[PDB]
Amino acid sequence: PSMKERQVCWGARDEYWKCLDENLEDASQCKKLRSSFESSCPQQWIKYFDKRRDYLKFKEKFEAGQFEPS
Template sequence: MPAPSSSERKACWDARDLLWKCLDDKDDKAAACQNFQSEFEAKCPAQWVKYFSKRRDYLKYKDKMQKEGFTPAQGPRQPS
């Protein structure tokens, strides 16, 4: 598979940005952004769709950890 041209990459990134904005505005309700999701999948290579989806999940998780902090889970009790 040849690498996407610069115009194809720009179209993909623009579609991704529109989808992410819609998801942010709609509290991650994918059904409300289905038309943007379809456009994103049509304009981007499948591997990029997978990467960008995981990337968004990671960025949202990272942002949540920075805002709310991290509380480690308690491990098993140590015998006395």
């Protein structure tokens, strides 16, 4: 994709993630920004970003559990 298209893809991924972060992962609340993300990014990049998101979220859950024993 062009430099512009890459920036629009990365910004649409940032807005979608920012949606999921702020709204405590309710993803049926970010269907508009998910559409924008899917329309803006190469299919391979959407797959890469979704897998990276899952990794980072579960890593955060893992490190949280270690820092705050109950």
